Design a protein around this motif. Sequence first.
Motif, PDB file in Angstrom:
ATOM      1  N   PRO A   1     -27.312  50.267  -0.453  1.00 57.67           N
ATOM      2  CA  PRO A   1     -27.214  49.234   0.613  1.00 57.67           C
ATOM      3  C   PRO A   1     -25.670  48.793   0.491  1.00 57.67           C
ATOM      4  O   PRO A   1     -25.656  48.030  -0.436  1.00 57.67           O
TER       5      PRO A   1
ATOM      6  N   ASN B   1     -12.328  45.110   8.900  1.00 53.15           N
ATOM      7  CA  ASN B   1     -11.345  46.467   8.530  1.00 53.15           C
ATOM      8  C   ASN B   1     -11.737  46.653   7.104  1.00 53.15           C
ATOM      9  O   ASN B   1     -12.402  47.741   6.769  1.00 53.15           O
TER      10      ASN B   1
ATOM     11  N   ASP C   1     -15.006  48.184   4.542  1.00 53.56           N
ATOM     12  CA  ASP C   1     -15.555  49.589   4.491  1.00 53.56           C
ATOM     13  C   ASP C   1     -15.627  50.087   3.281  1.00 53.56           C
ATOM     14  O   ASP C   1     -15.071  51.387   3.071  1.00 53.56           O
TER      15      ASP C   1
ATOM     16  N   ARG D   1     -23.299  44.352  11.229  1.00 51.59           N
ATOM     17  CA  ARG D   1     -23.133  45.871  11.459  1.00 51.59           C
ATOM     18  C   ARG D   1     -24.092  46.679  10.288  1.00 51.59           C
ATOM     19  O   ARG D   1     -23.657  46.712   9.406  1.00 51.59           O
TER      20      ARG D   1
ATOM     21  N   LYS E   1     -28.564  44.494   4.787  1.00 49.22           N
ATOM     22  CA  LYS E   1     -29.706  43.963   4.430  1.00 49.22           C
ATOM     23  C   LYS E   1     -29.506  42.446   4.381  1.00 49.22           C
ATOM     24  O   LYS E   1     -28.392  42.009   4.038  1.00 49.22           O
TER      25      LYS E   1
END
Lengths: 529, 545
Positions: free
Chosen positions: A294, A388, A391, A423, A429
Amino acid sequence: PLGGLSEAADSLRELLRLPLRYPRALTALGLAVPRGVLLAGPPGVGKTQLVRAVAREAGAELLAVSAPALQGSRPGETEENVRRVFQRARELASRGPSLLFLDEMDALCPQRGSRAPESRVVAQVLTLLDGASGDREVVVVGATNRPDALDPALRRPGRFDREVVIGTPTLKQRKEILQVITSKMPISSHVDLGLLAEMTVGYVGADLTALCREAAMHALLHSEKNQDNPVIDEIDFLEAFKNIQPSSFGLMDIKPVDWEEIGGLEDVKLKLKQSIEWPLKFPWEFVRMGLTQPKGVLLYGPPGCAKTTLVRALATSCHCSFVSVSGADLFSPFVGDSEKVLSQIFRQARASTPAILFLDEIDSILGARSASKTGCDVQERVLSVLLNELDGVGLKTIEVFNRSVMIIAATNRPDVLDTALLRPGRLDKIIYIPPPDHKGRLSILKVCTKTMPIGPDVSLENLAAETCFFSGADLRNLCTEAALLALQENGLDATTVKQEHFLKSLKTVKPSLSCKDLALYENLFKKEG
Amino acid sequence: FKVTYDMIGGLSSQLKAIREIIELPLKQPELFKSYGIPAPRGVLLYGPPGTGKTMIARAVANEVGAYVSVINGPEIISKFYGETEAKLRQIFAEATLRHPSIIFIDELDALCPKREGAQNEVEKRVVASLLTLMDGIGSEVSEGQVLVLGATNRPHALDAALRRPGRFDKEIEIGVPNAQDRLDILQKLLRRVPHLLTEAELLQLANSAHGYVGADLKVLCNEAGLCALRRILKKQPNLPDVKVAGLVKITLKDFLQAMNDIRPSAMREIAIDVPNVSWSDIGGLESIKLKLEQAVEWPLKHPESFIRMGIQPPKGVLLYGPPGCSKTMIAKALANESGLNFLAIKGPELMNKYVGESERAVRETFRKARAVAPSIIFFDELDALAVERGSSLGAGNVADRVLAQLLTEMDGIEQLKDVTILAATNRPDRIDKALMRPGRIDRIIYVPLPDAATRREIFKLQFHSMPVSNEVDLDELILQTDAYSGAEIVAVCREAALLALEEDIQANLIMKRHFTQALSTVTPRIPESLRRFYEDYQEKSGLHT
């Protein structure tokens, strides 16, 4: 020597060496090495000295021309002086390593909205560098303080892009540089240099130099007999430090803490163990197991549990490189730089690619969105650059090079933060951190008390029964103050402590951890999902 | 430098288009005069930065017959006043004397920013002078020979009057490349470098390059060369350049680490992606599959369905149900089955501090959609933007502006010549019926919760990626997984694998007792009342088929 600089020294060694330590026909094989670097930071510490030293270590001409000594009164003479220096650099490339060292480019670069001749100067030196690209061994080192002070038009790819900061004044480097300075000074023999060091928070090397300077200065002033051998005493040193101006100013907590300084909520401990450190073994674990890692986890508990302690203990139990991200470290008076330091620390994470990055109390780091509708634009800009940069992804598909940092955050007002942060794909988590139960209270009291002078009369379980609605810090300050009462009052010079003082201190610290606030916190940030 | 069509990668269709719109005039202009039909003054190029259209410009320039002549905004617009226009007119006339020539300008919005969007009236003087000069390009002596070429990102910030006819007609877009396009341009670069790569894993690497740009691909190539160099250096202490050159051979892992060190600059704009997911990745949904393929294939039957009777061109299909529960998966699945193109726009992201720039995004979205006409717009979480106004006094304003502009875009339903729109959300009530008014979005489907067979298929797709034990039993698993969603059940088996990992850091197979333990731990946070409401809305709404 390069006291307190050898690590940045060797990093820059390899970096600038790559074109110079190794020949060119390989570049002619279809490769264009970057040329021209930036040394940004408070100078005098050794920046000059270190560029000297590295041009030495490789073997290169220490052309330490001070570009501030080239200002001109009429436009055109300046450009000819730059012609002189850069042409000598060109013939140096004709001979060998043209390690041109040009300092203070930002004073040669007043940014836009300024006058005209800056344009001519910057474009002309750009011609120089872009032409000498053809020549074989042309390299320049712009030496300044902050990259922001330079010409924007001089930060392009194929231009001044390889930029590095001066050494951050670390403890280890602090001691190194103190010793290096005094290596030529007749300081007193007995020196607890570490004490003075830790006094000198934020003080860059040069500051320390100057501090020692005035120290020995008053040493020589208020002493006259031993005109040659001064026992430059630590007392005068201390008093000078006192006199000296404070420092001008991503601080990793060097303090290590284990799983012993913390008790209670061992469930959440095992959870953090689940979703963070087992990834270390991951390169073979999910193989025989499937499930991926995760990306992001968010731990939330009531302000007062000192979650930062748990985060640091995690960072301890893994050996992974760790950097902290805090609002006080963040809220500098430069608007538009918060995003920048964000990118910088993430780049450092990429550098020490096994990296665990902590986002504390992000409600402070990112305030309200639309509560004060007049000064909350750059905050949304940080929001965008975050969404941004967050990611960090890789191949991660069915050997493996696990080049994937991890990000973990924690706060106290998630109902304030931007909802898009959570998101699935950014923060996949979220974990709850309740204030300790009766048992957790008991345990954390026990462990916080394992060094205070205990008496044979105390009964921690009773406090545990009655010290409800107590944060960790609550109990810690409580036992603190009670120890104080016992010691001072009875034993001005004491040996033991009684529980009566804890009982009395109960009301002295009003515990306002109302269970209704607990339920509010929990409902809010459990529907926050 | 001899910049040849043999160097420019991707963009093939656009290459052909530009080549033809330019060649015939630059070959037989007296044909155009014989027709008397005018010769196109200029052509406006546009596309986000990075792809450095200058590549294309100099390419076509030194390709056929052009005498190059280039001017750039931040190179010209200094603190001069009309001297910019002086330089301009001088270039114009001198290249007029050089009739076989082409002038190009980049950042045309920079040199000519908006009237209300700028302040320096000198710049607007420059605008007017440019206008006059361009009419001097509509001149008789050299009718259609001084080709002006404009190229910048923003079509908006351009000056309106520039769109008046005979000044800037043909707008050619050059967007961020695609998988095949990335691959092509990468190959064209790599042409002259020693490497040991196979085009299949090369195509893999291409697939990796989401939000990547050409210029950045060149940077990637240089980086990988550098790093493989480093790798070799870490096996020889010293060497002369000869054996270095003799040994440098770029390989895969080189490219891997290379891409991993530097990040690209795209991926803020839209991207014409390709649906990667497959129907072989989801279970069941039989009637869903069939109704969906029908919904997408009828609009090409309505020619002949109209030939039969002729009633209506129904387009808008709208799914609804639990949150994100494999829905968007189904969307992409139909997308790939059709083979059309995907333009996702996630709802909640539409909130930007830049008032209207969200609208602007929607606008360019629809523009590209049209440009790639055989394509499908997608929406999700429509209710996010669809919180009704009045609640938030200063926030719902951009929301209603966006929704209005959305209606304003979709209006071209005829213009949407079989350009379908698929959307899906969770609480369909929260939308405005301005989207659910008849004609635009009428066909509706509730996504039924997965039945037993669908659950078993989910389990198959799960077991096919984790080594599981043999004490498995699909039956009672499916039994105790009702009131859950598929992805949730994926998380369940995931956590059971985690529990087995807790049993041993190097065990092999997960025990179903731990699975039942996980089942106990996981709770269905979705009550049947939600399904009741779903089916009630279904019963009490407009059309379904």
